[PDB]
Design an enzyme around this catalytic site. Structure first.
Site, PDB file in Angstrom:
ATOM      1  CG  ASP A 280       2.919 -17.853  -9.987  1.00 26.11           C
ATOM      2  OD1 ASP A 280       2.732 -19.084 -10.071  1.00 26.11           O
ATOM      3  OD2 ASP A 280       2.818 -17.221  -8.914  1.00 26.11           O
TER       4      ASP A 280
ATOM      5  CG  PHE B 145       9.166 -18.709  -3.026  1.00 28.42           C
ATOM      6  CD1 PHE B 145      10.327 -19.400  -2.724  1.00 28.42           C
ATOM      7  CD2 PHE B 145       8.427 -19.099  -4.129  1.00 28.42           C
ATOM      8  CE1 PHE B 145      10.739 -20.465  -3.503  1.00 28.42           C
ATOM      9  CE2 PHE B 145       8.832 -20.163  -4.911  1.00 28.42           C
ATOM     10  CZ  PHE B 145       9.989 -20.846  -4.598  1.00 28.42           C
TER      11      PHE B 145
ATOM     12  CE  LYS C 156       5.802 -11.528  -1.877  1.00 30.25           C
ATOM     13  NZ  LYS C 156       5.786 -12.043  -3.274  1.00 30.25           N
TER      14      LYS C 156
HETATM   15  C1  LIG Z   1     -14.700  -4.655   6.047  1.00 28.38           C
HETATM   16  C2  LIG Z   1     -14.685  -4.308   4.555  1.00 28.38           C
HETATM   17  C3  LIG Z   1     -13.620  -5.090   3.766  1.00 28.38           C
HETATM   18  O1  LIG Z   1     -12.857  -4.497   3.084  1.00 28.38           O
HETATM   19  N1  LIG Z   1     -13.536  -6.548   3.847  1.00 28.38           N
HETATM   20  C4  LIG Z   1     -12.492  -7.225   3.071  1.00 28.38           C
HETATM   21  C5  LIG Z   1     -12.816  -8.043   1.995  1.00 28.38           C
HETATM   22  C6  LIG Z   1     -11.805  -8.671   1.268  1.00 28.38           C
HETATM   23  C7  LIG Z   1     -10.474  -8.478   1.627  1.00 28.38           C
HETATM   24  C8  LIG Z   1      -9.328  -9.151   0.839  1.00 28.38           C
HETATM   25  O2  LIG Z   1      -9.520 -10.150   0.236  1.00 28.38           O
HETATM   26  N2  LIG Z   1      -8.018  -8.491   0.873  1.00 28.38           N
HETATM   27  C9  LIG Z   1      -6.802  -8.952   0.185  1.00 28.38           C
HETATM   28  C10 LIG Z   1      -6.545 -10.291  -0.071  1.00 28.38           C
HETATM   29  C11 LIG Z   1      -5.369 -10.650  -0.727  1.00 28.38           C
HETATM   30  C12 LIG Z   1      -4.456  -9.676  -1.121  1.00 28.38           C
HETATM   31  C13 LIG Z   1      -4.706  -8.335  -0.860  1.00 28.38           C
HETATM   32  N3  LIG Z   1      -3.797  -7.248  -1.245  1.00 28.38           N
HETATM   33  C14 LIG Z   1      -2.395  -7.362  -1.662  1.00 28.38           C
HETATM   34  N4  LIG Z   1      -1.725  -6.248  -1.881  1.00 28.38           N
HETATM   35  C15 LIG Z   1      -0.459  -6.258  -2.263  1.00 28.38           C
HETATM   36  C16 LIG Z   1       0.178  -7.480  -2.433  1.00 28.38           C
HETATM   37 CL1  LIG Z   1       1.888  -7.504  -2.948  1.00 28.38          CL
HETATM   38  C17 LIG Z   1      -0.544  -8.648  -2.200  1.00 28.38           C
HETATM   39  C18 LIG Z   1       0.055 -10.051  -2.360  1.00 28.38           C
HETATM   40  C19 LIG Z   1       0.986 -10.456  -3.304  1.00 28.38           C
HETATM   41  N5  LIG Z   1       1.233 -11.751  -3.110  1.00 28.38           N
HETATM   42  C20 LIG Z   1       0.475 -12.209  -2.069  1.00 28.38           C
HETATM   43  C21 LIG Z   1       0.377 -13.501  -1.489  1.00 28.38           C
HETATM   44  C22 LIG Z   1      -0.481 -13.719  -0.420  1.00 28.38           C
HETATM   45  C23 LIG Z   1      -1.247 -12.668   0.083  1.00 28.38           C
HETATM   46  C24 LIG Z   1      -1.152 -11.403  -0.485  1.00 28.38           C
HETATM   47  C25 LIG Z   1      -0.277 -11.179  -1.577  1.00 28.38           C
HETATM   48  N6  LIG Z   1      -1.808  -8.533  -1.822  1.00 28.38           N
HETATM   49  C26 LIG Z   1      -5.885  -7.988  -0.209  1.00 28.38           C
HETATM   50  C27 LIG Z   1     -10.153  -7.658   2.696  1.00 28.38           C
HETATM   51  C28 LIG Z   1     -11.161  -7.033   3.421  1.00 28.38           C
HETATM   52  C29 LIG Z   1     -13.291  -4.825   6.632  1.00 28.38           C
HETATM   53  N7  LIG Z   1     -13.115  -4.118   7.896  1.00 28.38           N
HETATM   54  C30 LIG Z   1     -13.552  -4.949   9.003  1.00 28.38           C
HETATM   55  C31 LIG Z   1     -13.832  -2.851   7.906  1.00 28.38           C
END
Ligand SMILES: *[C@H](CC(=O)Nc1ccc(C(=O)Nc2cccc(Nc3ncc(Cl)c(-c4c[nH]c5ccccc45)n3)c2)cc1)CN(C)C
Lengths: 284, 276, 65
Positions: free
Chosen positions: A115, A14, A26
């Site tokens: 969910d 959503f 979001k």
């Molecule tokens: C190098 C090092 C590094 O850190 N690489 C890396 C690996 C993995 C990820 C990752 O998967 N990050 C990620 C994915 C999904 C969600 C989140 N955080 C997050 N935080 C708050 C909220 Cl509210 C949410 C959320 C809630 N509902 C959602 C729907 C869709 C997506 C998010 C979501 N998610 C983190 C990242 C990095 C990197 N550099 C190059 C040094």
């Protein structure tokens, strides 16, 4: 505003979430402000647990609303799908412990997440697991939900009134995914999901579910013997198999709650759960 | 739950003096903004207008179709009271704020109603209904922001039902606790008019209504407080609870409904304020 | 470092609420609507409603601002 876009965290059911400056924003999609964002705000402004995501801010214009949460480094789906990460029994125990503590706190306040999936279980750099995506969460107790792969059989039968069992079945599915590194019951339709459930665990009878026929969307299936649990999970111990059996009971009343699962011998046995600072981290 | 809710943490105040101070501060702030006059209404006139428009909101929700749950009406009334604790009727018109409150209460309480059928309950022309809908959509975010994003409202109806269950179970002396329902509901309705919702917990309000009905029925249940509730161990707790009930009854008995002539004069003054 | 279960400690500022499993033995369930077979099939019982009502009736009864 006060936030600058940095990356793109993905697309929800959503909303569109992006990493901003660290927090996560979001962007919610003549009816006014979207009901999913209102539900998330109203439920996350009343809960305070280490294993539940906290709503940091909210803003917008007229009927457009945007939510700001604390930024979580990763989620459990990325952990599971990563082939370079070894999931030791201690890591699984720690993940299940944090999930169960969060769900027990949530259930004591009469809220069902509804969910739950590995992508909704967020992890930070300190190893603390939190539950997020409360856009479908509902309060229960006053007299067609969950993703299909993690949907409970009672939900697949069109149950209108339910309880904590719908969360506990998803918890069992997440545990099975952690054990096997693949989705446990990856169906493409409700009938297919029911067929996969009955093939893997066996078709329940009137003794394992005394009110099978009362549900409206109930259909009769073939009698499957069901694969033995220790055959599906070869490396699972006796206590882990008992926990899985309690988590996958067809009766939603007999299915173990979060407190009952936390009291089980699996968590108090050896080895202890891995501390959050030592949990596996996806390499960049 | 209430014992860790935002309603108890941020929206339950010590006394009516703090509420009066907040309302006077809101009035003074709006006056200072306008300066940067006889047309301005005093805080007591603002309170009279707020009470009149709360009654108007109550009768709007009474004849709402489809039938509106009582919890939604309580949530809307609490939203109105909380909004006009820190806002002046001379800046935001209560006629639109009541409708925005009803809209937000319907949304939050999971009472699924679409906008056309919401505005169809107004005794206005379709153009007027569309204008009201646009005003509600414009003011929804303002209402949410003025509530500090505290949308969950705890009403005394569920505690009332729980107390009735406990009376039916553990109090055989009260033979039929269902004969106290009507008078307790009337007392709850009279409580909703005063500022009791911002000063007391829902359980205390429900118990006050129940014991007021019992007293008006000639039944004394001091044993229910002392024995059934295990307050004979903690006497000062019983004294504090009884004092809270007495304060609630005093608040109820001293409430004065607004008068028609004053309401009309204040409505003219408010229309003059908003037009200019 | 093994794990030991510890119950959640949340203060309610009210009378003690009887345990959910004990509501049937204490006669509380005689004053609530009986759950239909469909409700029991879905995992919903009248004990949940009775427990929630009792928790709401006692929450914050001994609290002052
Ligand atoms: C190098 C090092 C590094 O850190 N690489 C890396 C690996 C993995 C990820 C990752 O998967 N990050 C990620 C994915 C999904 C969600 C989140 N955080 C997050 N935080 C708050 C909220 Cl509210 C949410 C959320 C809630 N509902 C959602 C729907 C869709 C997506 C998010 C979501 N998610 C983190 C990242 C990095 C990197 N550099 C190059 C040094």
């Amino acid at each position: 505003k006060r936030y600058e876009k940095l990356d793109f965290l993905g697309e929800g059911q959503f909303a569109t979430v992006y990493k901003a400056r660290i927090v996560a924003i979001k962007k919610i999609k003549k009816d006014g402000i979207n009901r999913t964002a209102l539900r998330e705000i109203k439920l996350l402004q009343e809960l305070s647990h280490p294993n539940i995501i906290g709503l940091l801010d909210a803003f917008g214009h007229k009927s457009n609303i945007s939510l700001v949460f604390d930024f979580m480094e990763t989620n459990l789906e990325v952990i599971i799908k990563d082939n370079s990460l070894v999931l030791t029994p201690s890591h699984i125990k720690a993940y299940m412990l944090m999930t169960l503590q969060g769900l027990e706190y949530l259930h004591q306040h009469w809220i069902l997440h509804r969910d739950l999936k590995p992508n909704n279980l967020l992890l930070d750099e300190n190893g603390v697991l939190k539950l997020a995506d409360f856009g479908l969460a509902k309060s229960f107790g006053s007299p067609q939900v969950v993703t299909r792969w993690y949907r409970a059989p009672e939900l697949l039968f069109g149950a209108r009134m339910y309880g904590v069992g719908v969360d506990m079945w998803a918890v069992g599915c997440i545990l099975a995914e952690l054990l096997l590194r693949v989705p446990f019951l990856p169906g493409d339709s409700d009938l297919d999901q029911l067929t996969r459930i009955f093939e893997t665990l066996g078709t329940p009878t009137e003794e394992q579910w005394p009110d099978m026929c009362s549900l409206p969307d109930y259909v009769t299936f073939k009698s499957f013997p069901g694969i033995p649990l220790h055959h599906i999970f070869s490396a699972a111990g006796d206590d882990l198999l008992d926990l899985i059996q309690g988590l996958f009971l067809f009766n939603p009343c007999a299915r173990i709650t979060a407190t009952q699962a936390l009291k089980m011998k699996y968590f108090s046995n050896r080895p202890g759960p891995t501390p959050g600072c030592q949990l596996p981290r996806p390499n960049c | 739950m209430y014992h860790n809710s935002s309603q108890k943490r941020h929206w339950t105040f010590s006394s009516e003096e703090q509420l009066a101070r907040l309302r006077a501060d809101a009035n003074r702030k709006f006056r200072c903004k306008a300066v940067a006059d006889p047309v301005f209404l005093e805080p007591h006139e603002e309170m009279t207008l707020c009470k009149y428009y709360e009654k108007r909101l109550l009768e709007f929700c009474s004849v709402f179709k489809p039938a509106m749950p009582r919890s939604v009406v309580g949530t809307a009334c609490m939203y109105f009271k909380r909004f006009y604790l820190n806002n002046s009727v001379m800046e935001y018109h209560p006629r639109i704020i009541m409708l925005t409150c009803a809209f937000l209460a319907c949304k939050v309480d999971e009472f699924n109603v679409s906008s056309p059928q919401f505005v169809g309950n107004l005794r206005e022309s379709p153009l007027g209904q569309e204008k009201a809908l646009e005003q509600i959509l414009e003011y929804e975010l303002l209402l949410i922001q003025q509530l500090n994003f505290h949308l969950i409202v705890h009403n005394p109806y569920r505690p009332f039902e729980g107390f009735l269950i406990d009376l039916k179970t553990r109090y055989p002396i009260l033979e039929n606790p269902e004969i106290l329902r009507k008078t307790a509901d009337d007392f709850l309705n009279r409580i909703a008019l005063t500022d009791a919702y911002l000063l007391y917990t829902p359980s205390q309000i429900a118990l006050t209504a129940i014991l007021s009905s019992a007293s008006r029925a000639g039944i004394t249940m001091e044993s229910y407080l002392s024995e059934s509730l295990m307050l004979k161990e903690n006497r000062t707790c019983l004294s504090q609870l009884l004092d809270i009930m007495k304060s609630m009854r005093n608040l109820v008995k001293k409430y004065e409904p607004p008068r028609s002539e004053e309401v009309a004069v204040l409505k003219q003054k408010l229309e003059r304020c908003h037009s200019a | 470092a093994l794990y030991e279960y510890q119950p959640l400690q949340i203060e309610t500022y009210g009378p003690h609420v009887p345990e959910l499993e004990m509501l049937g033995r204490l006669g509380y369930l005689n004053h609530v609507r009986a759950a239909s077979p469909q409700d029991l099939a879905g995992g919903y019982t009248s004990s949940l409603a009775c427990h929630r009502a009792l928790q709401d009736a006692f929450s914050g009864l001994f609290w002052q601002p």
